[PDB]
Amino acid sequence: AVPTTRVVVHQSAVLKKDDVSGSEIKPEGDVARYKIRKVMLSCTLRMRPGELVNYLIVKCSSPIVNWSAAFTAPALMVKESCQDMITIIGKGKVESNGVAGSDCTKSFNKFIRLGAGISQTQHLYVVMYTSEAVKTVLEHRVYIEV
Amino acid sequence: AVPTTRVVVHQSAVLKKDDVSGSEIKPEGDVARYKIRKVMLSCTLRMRPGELVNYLIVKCSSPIVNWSAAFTAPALMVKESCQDMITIIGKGKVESNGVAGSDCTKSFNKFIRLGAGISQTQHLYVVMYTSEAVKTVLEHRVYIEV
Amino acid sequence: AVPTTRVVVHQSAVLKKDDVSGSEIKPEGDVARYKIRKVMLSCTLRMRPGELVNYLIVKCSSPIVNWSAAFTAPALMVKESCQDMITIIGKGKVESNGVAGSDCTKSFNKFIRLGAGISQTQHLYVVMYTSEAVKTVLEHRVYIEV
Amino acid sequence: AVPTTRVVVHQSAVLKKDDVSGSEIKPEGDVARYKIRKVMLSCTLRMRPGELVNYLIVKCSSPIVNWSAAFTAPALMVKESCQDMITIIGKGKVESNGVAGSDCTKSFNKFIRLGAGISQTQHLYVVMYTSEAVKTVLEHRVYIEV
Amino acid sequence: AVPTTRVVVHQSAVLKKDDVSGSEIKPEGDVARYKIRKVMLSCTLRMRPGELVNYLIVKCSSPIVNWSAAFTAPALMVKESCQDMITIIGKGKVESNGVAGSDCTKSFNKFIRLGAGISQTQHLYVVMYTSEAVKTVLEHRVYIEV
Amino acid sequence: AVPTTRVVVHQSAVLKKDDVSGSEIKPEGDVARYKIRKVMLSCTLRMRPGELVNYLIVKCSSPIVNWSAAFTAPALMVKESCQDMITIIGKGKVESNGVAGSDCTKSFNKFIRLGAGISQTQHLYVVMYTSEAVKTVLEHRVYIEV
Amino acid sequence: AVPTTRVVVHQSAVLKKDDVSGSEIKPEGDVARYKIRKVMLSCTLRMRPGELVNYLIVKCSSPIVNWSAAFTAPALMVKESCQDMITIIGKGKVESNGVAGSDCTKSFNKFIRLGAGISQTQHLYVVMYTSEAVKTVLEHRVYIEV
Amino acid sequence: AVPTTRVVVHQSAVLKKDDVSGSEIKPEGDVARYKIRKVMLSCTLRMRPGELVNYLIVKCSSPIVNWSAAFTAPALMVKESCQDMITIIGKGKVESNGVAGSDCTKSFNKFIRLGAGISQTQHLYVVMYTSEAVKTVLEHRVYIEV
């Protein structure tokens, strides 16, 4: 009975080799006071044809500026300093099984069902460690309550 | 007890690189007044060996002319302008893990079970975002009630 | 328990003889992300004293630009092209039983109870076919959930 | 579960003073093999401002050519020759309470719910006795099963 | 299981200003020995545009010749001399809200359901007091058991 | 509740002595997408007054061109090559007990009740082996669901 | 308790680019009067390293000579002419994700459990559309009742 | 109710071709007296694009120095000398389906749920047999009770 709206926000990010990098998935700012219930994210990263992109999808309050200081580099393990600060709700890994120099274009889709919502003060993040310079076009349809 | 007929319509489409492009799946026009209950679509796209084809299968009334204005480009997210206009019932993604310059020929099959039918005034669409020029030969066996 | 607000929007329209003409009833734009639950519309059309105003109140997604291409002229029948596109929830007819040249001022009121709401992506319309140039002052108190 | 379609057919008829005149309400001929379940007819007759239009809505097989030989003139009574031939399912009367010489434009609407359908071999008729030359624009949305 | 027949008898009567005037509704005489169960009468009186026609529908044995001596003039009250002689089963009133000198044509319809029949020895009457010279075309479909 | 239609198709066939000959019973082609539920066939063969006409009524998919290669000559036995291809649902035999040279005119009627319908892709056949040149006028009222 | 025998029949077929081609899976002919209950087929097609082999496994009576006239080319959709003639019981698709010019050797295995058997008059087919010249070595262990 | 802590320890190991090599997964030594309940390990081995890494995850007391003397070389089978000494709780295999000389970077993730804990005297090991020189960056989030 709550008035739901499924808004779509995209986020383009060209990121370097070992950069653990996170993007907040949230409505476009013109909707404040929301409450994210479901997220359908589909990030289609163009990447080098031998490497991998290990992604995590984490609910946390207190928005994280530095990413390497909260997630470990070669695969996204939540460090114990931000252990209970950061709650993992999504995982995954996109490996490029392609050719020598023809860069692949692989996508991960994930339909996260957030239990008891994520408000505008909390932050739903998608963080990723790649192994080459990738060209993520990460967009997401959030299912907010406003 | 309703008189069912499983008709087969094919649709060839050579489409360019970032073209979000949709085809209506429907009987051949000689059958008006139908009611699509099940669709078995099998699109065998010949495509470049590094790219992907992200497809959506959407039930909507009010036939969509412009596709980029209703679905986002790099993966098919239903924009909030056409949010409740367009109902997603099928998803998927076909990635080309092949060679440098030998173009692959990959197919997606999908047996959509449409709840409470899709009449001739509604429109069942299959829309797809590719990442290179693909040669889709999308055909489909619909299971109409006439 | 949902925070309700009853906002009032007016819409003045002087429309010609056989013009099937529709106005969207919606909040004033400063409230996006609403959900219309009840509408009390009261349109007081000043009209010529021999004619009639046949009105329909229709819930539809996909906002209709051309009105004659979706509703028939002499009384508002939903054409079969937009058959399941357009859902009728209100009807009525205001006839002018007056004098030779003294133009009457007659009003229709309608308290539509919209089942399961009408969001900001759907469009609640009031469409009307008149038979002379009328001077509708159609205002409406919507009962949105924001 | 039967595939329903709501088609709209209009019928313009300018008819003279005491002409008992009937129009078959049926789909447009391009749909044969139908089965009419519901009819929403709305006839907006422009008429002289002192007279009346007494209409009947009758289900009958065996399509009636001569109308005065089956219905009585000053109000539509089914004559005993066609007594069980013709089944009344709708009645009504539109009186013009207007001015001396300013012709009114009055409409009757009727949502007939036909029990157990009306097939294409039966004929649903709307017959009317007027008392002046009227300009009926009788249209109707039938709810056929094909 | 009784053999029913719905016969139609019309009765034209041009009657003067304050004439309380009654017509027997009955089959055409070629059917004796009937038993009237239902009557659908529809009298379309053309009348002067300021006056009224107050009608009563009365079951009585002993056919009434003089009408003013059994019903009062300005509205049809059954006088106490013929109090239990005359049983009222239908009432009504047709008022002419029209113009100065353009005579209206207004009709009353009444579907009387006679309890336990009216035989050919009883008399079902429709009596009316007008207030100007009217041009009643009173016809009726009776539902006799023969 | 399915819209039924009882259409009548006739088929004239003058066939020779030992010709096992079959006619498809089906609607006239203007109705595609049907579903035959009941068939009332009545074939009135004029025949020589000493011979017999042994007929079979068979439901089969895959329309049979050659008849002797599926049914045996002197009485219609379904050969084992088309054993499960052809399902017998009607039998019979019309013998001519007449005169030396006065050719009789004998008819067989059969009201086949097809279980779970026969669609337009299946074929209901009536096949017959005669013993002289007969003049069959085989007509049939099918009871299709369209 | 029925005497079962699991016989093995192989079928070598080198077939061209867009050839929809079908092989009957059946015992070797020395066993007539069988009843196929289970089939374990394993076809190891050597094929070009970019293409696909879309196969269908279909139970039908009336053995099909022409394959393109019953199945559509780019993916095996059963055409509506042979709609109820041909019953699909197995599907699948073998894609070659290999190298430029080193031809792969990929196999599909399928253990079809045929409900209520397939006799020697019916025909169990495996039909396949390839996209290059393939070298199928399709063999199958059928589980007949004789 | 036991005080849980999820600590993250990484272990980099560049290991040669047929080296069965094991790493103890354990907290960093500053936490003694722990009790490992859950382990989320994610090892992202960069490896040659034709080979495989077969890994085992084994709970054992008595820390193993020599690895080839407890696990067999070409796939990790627990030898019968250390049969009940070593308890397997995790398995898996990472194959490199890539290119000629472009080394892939593939990861295995495993969320081991250790029944009744693993204390600091026991040793949870992850052992792996590769087939080329790999560059494992094996890190792990253990879920200890201190």
> DSSP readout, chain F?
----EEEEEE--EEE-TT-EEEEEE---SSS-S-EEEEEEEEEEEEE-TT-EEEEEEEEESS--S-STTTB-SSS-PBPGGGTTTEEEEEEEEEE----SS--EEEEEEEEEEEEEEEESSSEEEEEEEESS-EEE--EEEEEE--
Query: Would you list the DSSP string of G89-132?
Result: EEEEEEE----SS--EEEEEEEEEEEEEEEESSSEEEEEEEESS
Which of D4, D30, D106 has the highest number of chain C CBs within 10 A, making it the mutation to test binding with C?
Answer: D106
Which of B107, B110, B126, B136 has the highest number of chain G CBs within 10 A, making it the mutation to test binding with G?
Answer: B107
Considering only alpha carbons, which residue of chain D is nearest residue E140?
Answer: D77
Specify whether the CB–CB gap between G22 and G127 falls below 8 A. Answer: yes
* Phi and psi torsions of F119, nearest 5°: -80, -175
Q: Which residues of F49-66 are buried (b: 16+ CB within 10 A; e: fewer)?
A: bbbbbbbbbbbbbbebee
Specify whether the CB–CB gap between G109 and G45 falls below 8 A. Answer: no
- For residue B2, list chain F residues with Cβ-Cβ distance below 8 A: 2, 145
Minimum-distance CB partner of D34 among F1, F3, F31: F3
Considering only alpha carbons, which residue of chain D is nearest residue F34?
Answer: D33
Q: Which two three-digit tokens encode residue D77? A: 């009574």
Q: Measured in whole angstroms, how far is the alpha carbon of residue E88 from the centre of its chain? A: 11
Minimum-distance CB partner of F83 among G81, G85, G121: G121
The Cα F133–Cα G74 span in angstroms is: 50
Specify whether the CB–CB gap between A49 and A103 falls below 8 A. Answer: yes
Query: Would you list the DSSP string of C57-73?
Result: EEEESS--S-STTTB-S
Please provide the size of chain H in residues.
146
The Cα G17–Cα B142 span in angstroms is: 27
Judging contact as 3 or more Cβ pairs under 8 Å, the answer for C and B is yes
Judging contact as 3 or more Cβ pairs under 8 Å, the answer for B and E is no
Using the structure block, give the residue that is written with the tokens 């997220």: A39
Which of B48, B55, B77, B131 has the highest number of chain A CBs within 10 A, making it the mutation to test binding with A?
Answer: B77
Specify whether the CB–CB gap between E70 and E79 falls below 8 A. Answer: yes
The Cα E99–Cα B11 span in angstroms is: 67
The Cα G58–Cα D49 span in angstroms is: 73
C-beta neighbour count of C36 within 10 angstroms: 25
F29 CA: distance to closest CA in chain B (Å): 13
The Cα E31–Cα E137 span in angstroms is: 22
Asked if B122 and C84 come within 8 Å (Cβ–Cβ), the reply is yes
Using the structure block, give the residue that is written with the tokens 């007027």: D130
What radius of gyration do chain E's Cα atoms show?
15
C-beta neighbour count of F102 within 10 angstroms: 8
Minimum-distance CB partner of C72 among D8, D97, D100: D8
Give, rounded to a whole angstrom, the gap between the first and last alpha carbons of chain E.
12
Q: Cβ neighbours of residue E4 under 8 Å, at least 6 residues apart? A: E37, E143, E144, E145
Q: Which two three-digit tokens encode residue D145? A: 């099963």
- For residue B2, list chain D residues with Cβ-Cβ distance below 8 A: 1-3
Q: Cβ neighbours of residue E60 under 8 Å, at least 6 residues apart? A: E82, E85, E86, E87, E122, E123, E125
Give one word for E85, left, alpha or beta, with left for phi > 0 and alpha for psi -120 to 50: alpha
E135: enclosing H helix or E strand: strand E134-136
Instruction: Identify the CA nearest to D96 among candidates H35, C91, E96, A123.
Output: E96
Asked if H40 and A72 come within 8 Å (Cβ–Cβ), the reply is no
Q: Measured in whole angstroms, how far is the alpha carbon of residue G111 from the centre of its chain? A: 12
Give, rounded to a whole angstrom, the gap between the first and last alpha carbons of chain B.
12
Judging contact as 3 or more Cβ pairs under 8 Å, the answer for D and B is yes
Q: Measured in whole angstroms, how far is the alpha carbon of residue H70 from the centre of its chain? A: 15
- For residue D3, list chain F residues with Cβ-Cβ distance below 8 A: none
- For residue C80, list chain B residues with Cβ-Cβ distance below 8 A: 121
C-beta neighbour count of D89 within 10 angstroms: 16
Which of A99, A108, A144 has the highest number of chain B CBs within 10 A, making it the mutation to test binding with B?
Answer: A99
Q: Cβ neighbours of residue D25 under 8 Å, at least 6 residues apart? A: D9, D11, D36, D39, D41, D124, D125, D126, D138, D140, D142
Instruction: Identify the CA nearest to A3 among candidates D34, C122, D106.
Output: C122
F98 CA: distance to closest CA in chain G (Å): 41
F40 CA: distance to closest CA in chain G (Å): 24
* Angle in degrees, CA E98, E103, E108, rounded to 5: 75
Pairing of strands B123-130, B52-60: antiparallel
Considering only alpha carbons, which residue of chain F is nearest residue G60?
Answer: F85
The Cα G112–Cα G55 span in angstroms is: 13
Burial class (CB in 10 A: 0-12, 13-18, 19+), B33: buried
The Cα G124–Cα G120 span in angstroms is: 9
Asked if A50 and H103 come within 8 Å (Cβ–Cβ), the reply is yes
Q: Is the dihedral of CA B36, B42, B48, B49 positive or negative?
A: positive
The chains in contact with chain F, meaning 3 or more Cβ pairs closer than 8 Å, are B, D, G
Fill in the DSSP letter of residue C77: P
- For residue H94, list chain A residues with Cβ-Cβ distance below 8 A: none
Instruction: Identify the CA nearest to D12 among candidates A1, H126, F74, C74.
Output: C74
The Cα G90–Cα E127 span in angstroms is: 82
| Expt. technique | cryo-EM
Specify whether the CB–CB gap between C142 and C42 falls below 8 A. Answer: no
Using the structure block, give the residue that is written with the tokens 């047999």: H129
Burial class (CB in 10 A: 0-12, 13-18, 19+), E22: buried
Three-state SS annotation for chain D: CCCCEEEEEECCEEECCCCEEEEEECCCCCCCCCEEEEEEEEEEEEECCCCEEEEEEEEECCCCCCCCCCECCCCCCECHHHCCCEEEEEEEEEECCCCCCCCEEEEEEEEEEEEEEEECCCEEEEEEEECCCEEECCEEEEEECC
The Cα G9–Cα G143 span in angstroms is: 11
Amino acid present at A88: I
Q: Which two three-digit tokens encode residue D62? A: 């065996």
Asked if A80 and H8 come within 8 Å (Cβ–Cβ), the reply is yes
Specify whether the CB–CB gap between F41 and F138 falls below 8 A. Answer: yes
C-beta neighbour count of B63 within 10 angstroms: 15
Q: Which residues of E touch D (CB under 8 A)?
A: 5-8, 10, 40, 42-44, 46, 49, 97-107, 109, 137, 139-141
Q: How many CA atoms lie within 13 A of F127 on its CB side?
A: 32
Question: How many Cβ pairs closer than 8 A exist between chain D and F?
Answer: 22
Query: Would you call E64 helix, strand, or coil by DSSP?
Result: coil
Please provide the size of chain C in residues.
146
The chains in contact with chain C, meaning 3 or more Cβ pairs closer than 8 Å, are A, B, D
Q: Cβ neighbours of residue H46 under 8 Å, at least 6 residues apart? A: A131, H103, H104, H105, H134, H135, H137
Using the structure block, give the residue that is written with the tokens 């001396």: D100
F1 CA: distance to closest CA in chain D (Å): 7
Q: Measured in whole angstroms, how far is the alpha carbon of residue B33 from the centre of its chain? A: 21
Asked if C2 and A1 come within 8 Å (Cβ–Cβ), the reply is yes
Which of A4, A5, A7, A8 has the highest number of chain B CBs within 10 A, making it the mutation to test binding with B?
Answer: A8
The Cα A51–Cα A46 span in angstroms is: 11
Give, rounded to a whole angstrom, the gap between the first and last alpha carbons of chain C.
12
Query: Would you list the DSSP string of B21-71?
Result: EEEEE---SSS-S-EEEEEEEEEEEEE-TT-EEEEEEEEESS--S-STTTB
D128 CA: distance to closest CA in chain F (Å): 29
Instruction: Identify the CA nearest to A141 among candidates A44, A59, A41.
Output: A41
The Cα F114–Cα F58 span in angstroms is: 10
The chains in contact with chain A, meaning 3 or more Cβ pairs closer than 8 Å, are B, C, H
Specify whether the CB–CB gap between H134 and H53 falls below 8 A. Answer: yes
Specify whether the CB–CB gap between D100 and E101 falls below 8 A. Answer: yes
Q: Measured in whole angstroms, how far is the alpha carbon of residue D124 from the centre of its chain? A: 8
Considering only alpha carbons, which residue of chain D is nearest residue E12?
Answer: D74
Sheet strand arrangement including B139-144: B5-10, B139-144, B35-47, B104-119
Specify whether the CB–CB gap between H135 and A80 falls below 8 A. Answer: no
Q: Which two three-digit tokens encode residue B32? A: 């008006």
Using the structure block, give the residue that is written with the tokens 């078995």: B40
Q: Cβ neighbours of residue E58 under 8 Å, at least 6 residues apart? A: E78, E86, E87, E88, E89, E90, E124, E125, E126, E127
Fill in the DSSP letter of residue E74: S
Q: How many CA atoms lie within 13 A of A21 on its CB side?
A: 18
Q: Please name every residue paired with C108 in a beta bridge, in sequence order, or none if there are none.
A: C43
CA separation, residue E121 to residues E39, E56, E117, G54, H75 (Å): 17, 20, 11, 88, 112
Query: Would you call C14 helix, strand, or coil by DSSP?
Result: strand
Give, rounded to a whole angstrom, the gap between the first and last alpha carbons of chain H.
12
Amino acid present at F75: A
Q: Which residues of B71-86 are buried (b: 16+ CB within 10 A; e: fewer)?
A: bbbbbbbbbbebbbbb
Asked if C50 and D98 come within 8 Å (Cβ–Cβ), the reply is yes
Q: Which two three-digit tokens encode residue C134? A: 């009328």
Q: Which residues of F131-144 are buried (b: 16+ CB within 10 A; e: fewer)?
A: bbebebbbbbebbb
Question: How many Cβ pairs closer than 8 A exist between chain A and H?
Answer: 75
Specify whether the CB–CB gap between D123 and D72 falls below 8 A. Answer: no
Q: Which two three-digit tokens encode residue B112? A: 């959509």
Which of B5, B28, B141, B143 has the highest number of chain F CBs within 10 A, making it the mutation to test binding with F?
Answer: B5
Specify whether the CB–CB gap between D51 and D131 falls below 8 A. Answer: yes
CA separation, residue H110 to residues B99, C60, D62, H89 (Å): 31, 49, 78, 11
* Phi and psi torsions of B121, nearest 5°: -85, -35
Q: Which residues of C66-100 are buried (b: 16+ CB within 10 A; e: fewer)?
A: ebeebbbbbbbbbbbebbbbbeebbbebbbbbbee
C-beta neighbour count of H43 within 10 angstroms: 26
Asked if B5 and F120 come within 8 Å (Cβ–Cβ), the reply is yes
Asked if H105 and A78 come within 8 Å (Cβ–Cβ), the reply is no
Give one word for B81, left, alpha or beta, with left for phi > 0 and alpha for psi -120 to 50: alpha
Amino acid present at D109: N
The Cα F2–Cα B1 span in angstroms is: 8
E106 CA: distance to closest CA in chain D (Å): 7
C-beta neighbour count of H86 within 10 angstroms: 22
Using the structure block, give the residue that is written with the tokens 């035999």: F93
Query: Would you call E1 helix, strand, or coil by DSSP?
Result: coil
Judging contact as 3 or more Cβ pairs under 8 Å, the answer for B and F is yes
C-beta neighbour count of A100 within 10 angstroms: 14
What radius of gyration do chain H's Cα atoms show?
15
Give one word for A37, left, alpha or beta, with left for phi > 0 and alpha for psi -120 to 50: alpha
What radius of gyration do chain A's Cα atoms show?
15
Judging contact as 3 or more Cβ pairs under 8 Å, the answer for C and F is no
Using the structure block, give the residue that is written with the tokens 């291409």: C69
CA separation, residue C115 to residues A1, C25, C83 (Å): 11, 16, 19
The chains in contact with chain H, meaning 3 or more Cβ pairs closer than 8 Å, are A
Minimum-distance CB partner of D145 among F3, F30, F31: F3
Considering only alpha carbons, which residue of chain F is nearest residue D33?
Answer: F146
The Cα E122–Cα E144 span in angstroms is: 13
The Cα E16–Cα E130 span in angstroms is: 8
Instruction: Identify the CA nearest to C32 among candidates C5, C72, C66.
Output: C5
The Cα G80–Cα E93 span in angstroms is: 66
Specify whether the CB–CB gap between A103 and A5 falls below 8 A. Answer: no
Query: Would you call B88 helix, strand, or coil by DSSP?
Result: strand
The Cα H21–Cα H12 span in angstroms is: 12
Amino acid present at D53: V
* Phi and psi torsions of F58, nearest 5°: -130, 130
